Amino acid sequence: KGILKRKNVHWPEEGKLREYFYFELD
Amino acid sequence: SLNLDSIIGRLLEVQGSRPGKNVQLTENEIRGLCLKSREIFLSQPILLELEAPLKICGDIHGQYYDLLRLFEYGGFPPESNYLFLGDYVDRGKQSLETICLLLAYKIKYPENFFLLRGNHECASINRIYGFYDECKRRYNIKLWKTFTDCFNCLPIAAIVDEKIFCCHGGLSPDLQSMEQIRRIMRPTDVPDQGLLCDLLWSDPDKDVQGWGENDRGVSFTFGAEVVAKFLHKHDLDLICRAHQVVEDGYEFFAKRQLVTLFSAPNYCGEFDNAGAMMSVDETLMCSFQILKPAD
Ligand SMILES: [Cl-]
Ligand SMILES: [Cl-]
Ligand SMILES: [Mn+2]
Ligand SMILES: [Mn+2]
């Protein structure tokens, strides 16, 4: 199912643009 | 000959382990990763033409446990497709684990996992900024030279679905046609000036009109109108690049015509930046996954 070889780039609504992941640093 | 699954398993088994724990592969295993990935790099084009969906990541700089977090949150290969934009080595403490996992995944999933060259995949840079010292301490000088021969064959740019142009650094005043990238022969070092140098070294700048001198002492800056003209001329929608630390892990330029990605949070232990990757779905809907230490 490889991805090496007309669409348009678009963006979500502002509240769905970023998904955050927090982690504990040591 | 290459016990590729064994290597990957040993690289992944330190996840969550004692903080900073090394994974020490054998030198033959590492030489095998370099040799087999080099073959694959040379068999694939230097300008990768890719289809969505995929996740795009910026600089890692040897922060191995942040790379593992990227995969944990983005999906371990082959659950997600990946394009990395370069700067795997130097500055961090675990350049070797970082590059070995990336090369192993390139060999394991060669048409679903991709690595571009950054300006630190260059012997005259990474001799100084950490990678050679790590190789000499943990292996030997011959292995560092083996890495250099592998890095000299990395591809230089990618275009996703004819709309997203990807490279480590940025545009070049010498880039008129994509054919000029396709004509670059490998193996090659990174020159001190010219197209290949600029693709790995240039930066966008909000204050320059046209092309300016780059504060790095190498290559150029380019302004927002350079970006607009390039996109229009080549029927592209977006430039996606890395190379600069940005506080939120990603940063837009020129009204979303360019984005900078940086994937090493709290870079060097000195900055308080997040890392980000950009997900591109099948319709080229683009969003960001942001990795940050809790505060
Ligand atoms: Cl994906
Ligand atoms: Cl400009
Ligand atoms: Mn960098
Ligand atoms: Mn860089």
mmCIF file of C-alpha atoms and ligand atoms in Angstrom:
data_model
loop_
_atom_site.group_PDB
_atom_site.id
_atom_site.type_symbol
_atom_site.label_atom_id
_atom_site.label_comp_id
_atom_site.label_asym_id
_atom_site.label_seq_id
_atom_site.Cartn_x
_atom_site.Cartn_y
_atom_site.Cartn_z
ATOM 1 C CA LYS A 1 0.000 0.000 0.000
ATOM 2 C CA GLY A 2 2.813 2.395 -0.909
ATOM 3 C CA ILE A 3 2.640 6.155 -1.341
ATOM 4 C CA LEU A 4 5.663 6.603 -3.647
ATOM 5 C CA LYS A 5 4.545 7.569 -7.185
ATOM 6 C CA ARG A 6 -6.520 17.417 -8.382
ATOM 7 C CA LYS A 7 -6.454 18.124 -4.629
ATOM 8 C CA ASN A 8 -6.121 21.315 -2.606
ATOM 9 C CA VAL A 9 -4.538 21.940 0.785
ATOM 10 C CA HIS A 10 -7.066 23.093 3.367
ATOM 11 C CA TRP A 11 -7.312 23.518 7.119
ATOM 12 C CA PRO A 12 -9.805 22.494 9.839
ATOM 13 C CA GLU A 13 -11.813 24.913 11.929
ATOM 14 C CA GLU A 14 -9.663 26.747 14.460
ATOM 15 C CA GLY A 15 -10.536 24.508 17.401
ATOM 16 C CA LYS A 16 -9.558 21.370 15.465
ATOM 17 C CA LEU A 17 -6.210 22.599 14.072
ATOM 18 C CA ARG A 18 -4.055 21.461 17.023
ATOM 19 C CA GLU A 19 -4.097 18.233 19.029
ATOM 20 C CA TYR A 20 -1.950 18.367 22.175
ATOM 21 C CA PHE A 21 -0.019 15.540 23.826
ATOM 22 C CA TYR A 22 1.628 16.212 27.170
ATOM 23 C CA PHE A 23 4.354 14.077 28.686
ATOM 24 C CA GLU A 24 6.242 13.994 31.957
ATOM 25 C CA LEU A 25 9.893 14.922 31.547
ATOM 26 C CA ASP A 26 12.578 13.257 33.660
ATOM 27 C CA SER B 1 21.391 -11.336 6.517
ATOM 28 C CA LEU B 2 20.064 -8.243 8.325
ATOM 29 C CA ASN B 3 18.110 -9.192 11.471
ATOM 30 C CA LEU B 4 15.938 -6.154 10.935
ATOM 31 C CA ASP B 5 13.068 -7.133 13.244
ATOM 32 C CA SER B 6 15.493 -7.915 16.069
ATOM 33 C CA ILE B 7 17.104 -4.482 15.695
ATOM 34 C CA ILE B 8 13.766 -2.665 15.732
ATOM 35 C CA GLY B 9 12.590 -4.638 18.747
ATOM 36 C CA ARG B 10 15.700 -3.753 20.738
ATOM 37 C CA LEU B 11 15.358 -0.086 19.767
ATOM 38 C CA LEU B 12 11.713 -0.012 20.866
ATOM 39 C CA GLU B 13 12.044 -2.025 24.083
ATOM 40 C CA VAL B 14 13.600 0.891 26.045
ATOM 41 C CA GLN B 15 10.385 2.912 25.748
ATOM 42 C CA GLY B 16 9.481 3.968 29.272
ATOM 43 C CA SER B 17 12.664 2.379 30.680
ATOM 44 C CA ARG B 18 15.288 4.012 32.884
ATOM 45 C CA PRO B 19 15.580 7.637 31.700
ATOM 46 C CA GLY B 20 18.138 8.127 28.954
ATOM 47 C CA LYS B 21 18.880 4.399 28.606
ATOM 48 C CA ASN B 22 20.984 3.641 25.529
ATOM 49 C CA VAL B 23 20.354 0.976 22.939
ATOM 50 C CA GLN B 24 23.763 -0.310 21.835
ATOM 51 C CA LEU B 25 23.473 -2.197 18.551
ATOM 52 C CA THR B 26 26.475 -4.042 17.154
ATOM 53 C CA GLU B 27 28.636 -2.214 14.653
ATOM 54 C CA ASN B 28 27.792 -4.868 12.041
ATOM 55 C CA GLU B 29 24.091 -4.221 12.617
ATOM 56 C CA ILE B 30 24.614 -0.493 12.165
ATOM 57 C CA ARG B 31 26.778 -0.953 9.077
ATOM 58 C CA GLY B 32 24.008 -3.159 7.687
ATOM 59 C CA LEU B 33 21.387 -0.467 8.267
ATOM 60 C CA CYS B 34 23.570 2.081 6.478
ATOM 61 C CA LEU B 35 24.355 -0.179 3.538
ATOM 62 C CA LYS B 36 20.794 -1.374 2.939
ATOM 63 C CA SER B 37 19.187 2.036 3.402
ATOM 64 C CA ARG B 38 21.775 3.568 1.063
ATOM 65 C CA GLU B 39 20.708 1.103 -1.658
ATOM 66 C CA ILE B 40 17.076 2.095 -1.158
ATOM 67 C CA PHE B 41 17.852 5.834 -1.173
ATOM 68 C CA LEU B 42 19.706 5.500 -4.470
ATOM 69 C CA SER B 43 16.939 3.377 -6.030
ATOM 70 C CA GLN B 44 14.284 5.960 -5.200
ATOM 71 C CA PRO B 45 14.207 9.435 -6.755
ATOM 72 C CA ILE B 46 16.075 12.360 -5.227
ATOM 73 C CA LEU B 47 12.827 14.360 -5.509
ATOM 74 C CA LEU B 48 10.232 12.096 -3.902
ATOM 75 C CA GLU B 49 6.732 12.319 -5.322
ATOM 76 C CA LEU B 50 4.391 11.085 -2.613
ATOM 77 C CA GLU B 51 0.667 10.598 -2.132
ATOM 78 C CA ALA B 52 -1.282 11.446 0.988
ATOM 79 C CA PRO B 53 -2.032 10.405 3.744
ATOM 80 C CA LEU B 54 1.165 10.884 5.733
ATOM 81 C CA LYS B 55 2.623 12.616 8.755
ATOM 82 C CA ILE B 56 5.482 15.084 8.281
ATOM 83 C CA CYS B 57 8.092 15.696 10.990
ATOM 84 C CA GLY B 58 10.860 18.298 11.442
ATOM 85 C CA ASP B 59 14.173 18.281 13.326
ATOM 86 C CA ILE B 60 14.941 15.526 15.880
ATOM 87 C CA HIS B 61 18.623 16.210 16.721
ATOM 88 C CA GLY B 62 19.269 12.986 18.604
ATOM 89 C CA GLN B 63 16.371 13.344 21.093
ATOM 90 C CA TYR B 64 15.609 9.662 20.815
ATOM 91 C CA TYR B 65 12.849 9.453 23.410
ATOM 92 C CA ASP B 66 11.054 12.353 21.744
ATOM 93 C CA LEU B 67 11.207 10.400 18.480
ATOM 94 C CA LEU B 68 9.609 7.434 20.280
ATOM 95 C CA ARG B 69 6.889 9.769 21.590
ATOM 96 C CA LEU B 70 6.252 11.021 18.050
ATOM 97 C CA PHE B 71 5.620 7.439 16.954
ATOM 98 C CA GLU B 72 3.579 6.673 20.072
ATOM 99 C CA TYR B 73 1.229 9.589 19.414
ATOM 100 C CA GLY B 74 1.308 9.557 15.602
ATOM 101 C CA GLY B 75 1.190 5.783 15.216
ATOM 102 C CA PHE B 76 4.112 3.380 14.918
ATOM 103 C CA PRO B 77 4.986 2.363 11.345
ATOM 104 C CA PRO B 78 3.229 0.957 9.431
ATOM 105 C CA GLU B 79 0.070 2.324 11.119
ATOM 106 C CA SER B 80 0.963 5.755 9.722
ATOM 107 C CA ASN B 81 3.067 6.886 6.770
ATOM 108 C CA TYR B 82 5.954 9.242 7.554
ATOM 109 C CA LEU B 83 8.113 11.877 5.881
ATOM 110 C CA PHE B 84 10.962 13.296 7.965
ATOM 111 C CA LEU B 85 12.607 16.564 6.892
ATOM 112 C CA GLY B 86 16.180 15.997 8.182
ATOM 113 C CA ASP B 87 18.489 16.941 11.077
ATOM 114 C CA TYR B 88 18.354 13.536 12.771
ATOM 115 C CA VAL B 89 21.776 13.839 14.405
ATOM 116 C CA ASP B 90 23.853 16.320 16.475
ATOM 117 C CA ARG B 91 23.178 18.322 19.670
ATOM 118 C CA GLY B 92 21.149 15.597 21.417
ATOM 119 C CA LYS B 93 22.511 12.725 23.447
ATOM 120 C CA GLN B 94 21.254 9.784 21.356
ATOM 121 C CA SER B 95 21.889 10.523 17.688
ATOM 122 C CA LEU B 96 22.819 6.870 17.097
ATOM 123 C CA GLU B 97 19.553 5.374 18.380
ATOM 124 C CA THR B 98 17.625 8.076 16.510
ATOM 125 C CA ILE B 99 19.202 7.506 13.105
ATOM 126 C CA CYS B 100 19.296 3.710 13.490
ATOM 127 C CA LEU B 101 15.550 3.522 14.171
ATOM 128 C CA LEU B 102 14.809 5.824 11.201
ATOM 129 C CA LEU B 103 17.024 3.777 8.862
ATOM 130 C CA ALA B 104 15.511 0.518 10.128
ATOM 131 C CA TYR B 105 11.995 1.768 9.416
ATOM 132 C CA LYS B 106 13.118 2.995 5.989
ATOM 133 C CA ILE B 107 14.362 -0.529 5.184
ATOM 134 C CA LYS B 108 11.319 -2.212 6.725
ATOM 135 C CA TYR B 109 8.667 -0.004 5.014
ATOM 136 C CA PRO B 110 10.499 1.475 2.005
ATOM 137 C CA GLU B 111 7.445 2.897 0.191
ATOM 138 C CA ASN B 112 5.646 4.140 3.310
ATOM 139 C CA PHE B 113 8.477 5.773 5.276
ATOM 140 C CA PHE B 114 10.751 8.547 3.959
ATOM 141 C CA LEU B 115 13.758 10.552 5.125
ATOM 142 C CA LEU B 116 15.031 13.809 3.584
ATOM 143 C CA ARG B 117 18.526 15.254 4.058
ATOM 144 C CA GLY B 118 19.024 18.115 6.520
ATOM 145 C CA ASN B 119 22.092 20.303 6.808
ATOM 146 C CA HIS B 120 23.369 18.161 9.710
ATOM 147 C CA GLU B 121 23.444 15.035 7.489
ATOM 148 C CA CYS B 122 26.794 16.346 6.316
ATOM 149 C CA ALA B 123 30.227 15.290 7.621
ATOM 150 C CA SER B 124 31.687 18.775 7.874
ATOM 151 C CA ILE B 125 28.783 19.816 10.136
ATOM 152 C CA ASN B 126 28.215 16.706 12.216
ATOM 153 C CA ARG B 127 31.946 16.238 12.853
ATOM 154 C CA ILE B 128 31.586 19.321 15.055
ATOM 155 C CA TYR B 129 28.101 19.343 16.525
ATOM 156 C CA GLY B 130 28.082 15.972 18.280
ATOM 157 C CA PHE B 131 27.533 13.000 15.987
ATOM 158 C CA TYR B 132 31.192 12.222 15.291
ATOM 159 C CA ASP B 133 31.953 12.432 19.028
ATOM 160 C CA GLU B 134 29.101 10.003 19.743
ATOM 161 C CA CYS B 135 30.325 7.580 17.054
ATOM 162 C CA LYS B 136 33.915 7.764 18.304
ATOM 163 C CA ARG B 137 32.863 7.215 21.929
ATOM 164 C CA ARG B 138 30.401 4.369 21.352
ATOM 165 C CA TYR B 139 31.862 2.713 18.202
ATOM 166 C CA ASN B 140 34.817 3.984 16.125
ATOM 167 C CA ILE B 141 35.752 6.472 13.395
ATOM 168 C CA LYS B 142 35.205 3.957 10.581
ATOM 169 C CA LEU B 143 31.515 3.726 11.489
ATOM 170 C CA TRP B 144 31.164 7.531 11.324
ATOM 171 C CA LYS B 145 32.558 7.425 7.795
ATOM 172 C CA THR B 146 30.032 4.704 6.915
ATOM 173 C CA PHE B 147 27.238 7.028 8.068
ATOM 174 C CA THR B 148 28.618 9.826 5.904
ATOM 175 C CA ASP B 149 28.495 7.624 2.804
ATOM 176 C CA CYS B 150 24.857 6.807 3.619
ATOM 177 C CA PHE B 151 23.853 10.440 4.299
ATOM 178 C CA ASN B 152 25.463 11.508 1.015
ATOM 179 C CA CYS B 153 22.708 9.515 -0.732
ATOM 180 C CA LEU B 154 19.638 10.893 1.075
ATOM 181 C CA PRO B 155 16.946 12.487 -1.128
ATOM 182 C CA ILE B 156 16.615 16.244 -1.013
ATOM 183 C CA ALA B 157 12.939 17.193 -1.441
ATOM 184 C CA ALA B 158 9.433 15.775 -1.720
ATOM 185 C CA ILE B 159 6.175 16.869 -3.328
ATOM 186 C CA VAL B 160 2.945 15.510 -1.840
ATOM 187 C CA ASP B 161 0.083 15.139 -4.377
ATOM 188 C CA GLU B 162 1.534 17.905 -6.562
ATOM 189 C CA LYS B 163 0.641 20.503 -3.905
ATOM 190 C CA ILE B 164 2.976 20.393 -0.833
ATOM 191 C CA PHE B 165 6.671 21.073 -1.497
ATOM 192 C CA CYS B 166 8.873 19.725 1.317
ATOM 193 C CA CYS B 167 12.551 20.279 2.073
ATOM 194 C CA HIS B 168 14.699 20.871 5.131
ATOM 195 C CA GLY B 169 15.769 24.484 4.654
ATOM 196 C CA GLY B 170 13.897 26.354 1.965
ATOM 197 C CA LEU B 171 13.815 27.983 -1.450
ATOM 198 C CA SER B 172 16.775 28.868 -3.630
ATOM 199 C CA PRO B 173 17.281 31.775 -6.038
ATOM 200 C CA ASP B 174 18.672 29.061 -8.353
ATOM 201 C CA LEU B 175 15.520 26.913 -8.285
ATOM 202 C CA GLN B 176 13.659 27.643 -11.526
ATOM 203 C CA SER B 177 12.485 24.123 -12.411
ATOM 204 C CA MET B 178 11.995 20.965 -10.352
ATOM 205 C CA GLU B 179 14.150 19.293 -13.000
ATOM 206 C CA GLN B 180 17.189 21.028 -11.480
ATOM 207 C CA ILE B 181 16.596 19.022 -8.274
ATOM 208 C CA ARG B 182 16.063 15.806 -10.239
ATOM 209 C CA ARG B 183 19.380 16.414 -12.033
ATOM 210 C CA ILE B 184 21.457 16.381 -8.817
ATOM 211 C CA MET B 185 23.605 13.237 -8.721
ATOM 212 C CA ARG B 186 24.305 11.098 -5.651
ATOM 213 C CA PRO B 187 26.372 10.422 -3.628
ATOM 214 C CA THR B 188 27.188 14.068 -3.030
ATOM 215 C CA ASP B 189 28.407 16.298 -0.253
ATOM 216 C CA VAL B 190 26.504 19.516 0.533
ATOM 217 C CA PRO B 191 28.262 22.420 -1.255
ATOM 218 C CA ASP B 192 28.954 25.790 0.330
ATOM 219 C CA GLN B 193 26.630 27.589 -2.106
ATOM 220 C CA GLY B 194 24.104 26.842 -4.807
ATOM 221 C CA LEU B 195 20.825 24.991 -5.158
ATOM 222 C CA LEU B 196 21.565 21.991 -2.921
ATOM 223 C CA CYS B 197 23.033 24.231 -0.216
ATOM 224 C CA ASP B 198 19.963 26.499 -0.240
ATOM 225 C CA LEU B 199 17.482 23.606 -0.070
ATOM 226 C CA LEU B 200 19.166 22.508 3.181
ATOM 227 C CA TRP B 201 20.064 25.937 4.660
ATOM 228 C CA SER B 202 17.782 28.856 3.658
ATOM 229 C CA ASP B 203 15.139 30.462 5.918
ATOM 230 C CA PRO B 204 12.003 32.547 5.431
ATOM 231 C CA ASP B 205 12.155 36.061 6.827
ATOM 232 C CA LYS B 206 9.212 38.411 7.422
ATOM 233 C CA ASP B 207 11.414 41.512 7.060
ATOM 234 C CA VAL B 208 13.228 40.821 3.780
ATOM 235 C CA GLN B 209 11.954 41.786 0.349
ATOM 236 C CA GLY B 210 13.204 39.227 -2.127
ATOM 237 C CA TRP B 211 16.438 37.454 -1.151
ATOM 238 C CA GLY B 212 18.674 38.534 1.729
ATOM 239 C CA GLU B 213 21.855 37.462 3.507
ATOM 240 C CA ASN B 214 21.270 34.660 6.004
ATOM 241 C CA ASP B 215 22.461 35.303 9.570
ATOM 242 C CA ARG B 216 23.790 31.731 9.647
ATOM 243 C CA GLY B 217 26.600 32.788 7.298
ATOM 244 C CA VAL B 218 25.390 30.224 4.709
ATOM 245 C CA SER B 219 22.750 30.645 1.939
ATOM 246 C CA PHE B 220 19.893 33.183 1.980
ATOM 247 C CA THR B 221 16.668 34.411 3.499
ATOM 248 C CA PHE B 222 13.577 34.804 1.337
ATOM 249 C CA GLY B 223 10.447 36.893 1.850
ATOM 250 C CA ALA B 224 6.716 36.326 1.592
ATOM 251 C CA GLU B 225 6.481 37.462 -2.043
ATOM 252 C CA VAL B 226 9.154 34.975 -3.084
ATOM 253 C CA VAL B 227 6.950 32.283 -1.548
ATOM 254 C CA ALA B 228 3.801 33.475 -3.324
ATOM 255 C CA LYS B 229 5.528 33.632 -6.730
ATOM 256 C CA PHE B 230 7.040 30.167 -6.282
ATOM 257 C CA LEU B 231 3.710 28.584 -5.366
ATOM 258 C CA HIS B 232 1.910 30.248 -8.271
ATOM 259 C CA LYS B 233 4.596 29.387 -10.816
ATOM 260 C CA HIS B 234 4.669 25.718 -9.780
ATOM 261 C CA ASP B 235 0.935 25.301 -9.035
ATOM 262 C CA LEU B 236 1.646 24.435 -5.391
ATOM 263 C CA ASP B 237 -0.376 25.248 -2.276
ATOM 264 C CA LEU B 238 2.143 24.965 0.562
ATOM 265 C CA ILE B 239 5.852 24.862 1.387
ATOM 266 C CA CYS B 240 6.594 22.595 4.360
ATOM 267 C CA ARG B 241 10.093 22.876 5.846
ATOM 268 C CA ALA B 242 11.956 22.603 9.153
ATOM 269 C CA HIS B 243 15.439 23.836 10.185
ATOM 270 C CA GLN B 244 14.328 26.563 12.669
ATOM 271 C CA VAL B 245 13.176 26.030 16.239
ATOM 272 C CA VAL B 246 9.691 27.490 16.704
ATOM 273 C CA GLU B 247 7.961 27.931 20.054
ATOM 274 C CA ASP B 248 4.781 25.996 19.261
ATOM 275 C CA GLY B 249 6.425 23.229 17.209
ATOM 276 C CA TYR B 250 4.922 24.602 13.998
ATOM 277 C CA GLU B 251 4.819 28.123 12.649
ATOM 278 C CA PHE B 252 3.068 29.641 9.658
ATOM 279 C CA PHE B 253 4.656 32.156 7.267
ATOM 280 C CA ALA B 254 3.101 34.319 4.524
ATOM 281 C CA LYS B 255 -0.579 33.650 5.367
ATOM 282 C CA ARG B 256 -0.316 29.823 5.590
ATOM 283 C CA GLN B 257 1.629 29.551 2.312
ATOM 284 C CA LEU B 258 4.602 28.121 4.247
ATOM 285 C CA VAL B 259 4.870 26.193 7.500
ATOM 286 C CA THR B 260 7.956 25.441 9.597
ATOM 287 C CA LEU B 261 7.945 22.156 11.554
ATOM 288 C CA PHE B 262 10.284 21.381 14.452
ATOM 289 C CA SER B 263 9.900 18.062 16.253
ATOM 290 C CA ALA B 264 12.383 18.221 19.179
ATOM 291 C CA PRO B 265 10.636 19.682 22.290
ATOM 292 C CA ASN B 266 12.701 21.763 24.745
ATOM 293 C CA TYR B 267 15.474 21.703 22.167
ATOM 294 C CA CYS B 268 18.908 21.135 23.784
ATOM 295 C CA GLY B 269 17.266 21.419 27.198
ATOM 296 C CA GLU B 270 17.672 25.161 26.545
ATOM 297 C CA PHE B 271 14.449 26.219 24.785
ATOM 298 C CA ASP B 272 10.897 25.815 26.012
ATOM 299 C CA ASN B 273 9.440 24.883 22.660
ATOM 300 C CA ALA B 274 6.966 22.225 21.725
ATOM 301 C CA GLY B 275 7.551 19.723 18.956
ATOM 302 C CA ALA B 276 4.992 19.240 16.206
ATOM 303 C CA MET B 277 4.194 16.968 13.313
ATOM 304 C CA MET B 278 1.743 17.749 10.528
ATOM 305 C CA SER B 279 -0.870 15.183 9.530
ATOM 306 C CA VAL B 280 -1.975 15.331 5.895
ATOM 307 C CA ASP B 281 -5.097 13.298 5.198
ATOM 308 C CA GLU B 282 -6.196 11.919 1.835
ATOM 309 C CA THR B 283 -7.885 15.229 0.871
ATOM 310 C CA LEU B 284 -4.822 17.304 1.930
ATOM 311 C CA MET B 285 -6.566 18.458 5.063
ATOM 312 C CA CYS B 286 -3.589 19.460 7.228
ATOM 313 C CA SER B 287 -3.494 19.603 11.020
ATOM 314 C CA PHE B 288 -0.893 19.565 13.788
ATOM 315 C CA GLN B 289 -0.122 17.141 16.595
ATOM 316 C CA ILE B 290 1.805 19.015 19.308
ATOM 317 C CA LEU B 291 4.143 17.315 21.828
ATOM 318 C CA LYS B 292 5.059 19.237 24.987
ATOM 319 C CA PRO B 293 6.371 18.377 28.455
ATOM 320 C CA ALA B 294 3.730 18.950 31.106
ATOM 321 C CA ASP B 295 4.182 22.098 33.209
HETATM 322 CL CL CL C 1 -0.778 8.264 7.569
HETATM 323 CL CL CL C 2 9.681 38.859 -0.858
HETATM 324 MN MN MN C 3 18.282 21.694 13.068
HETATM 325 MN MN MN C 4 18.862 22.443 9.906
#
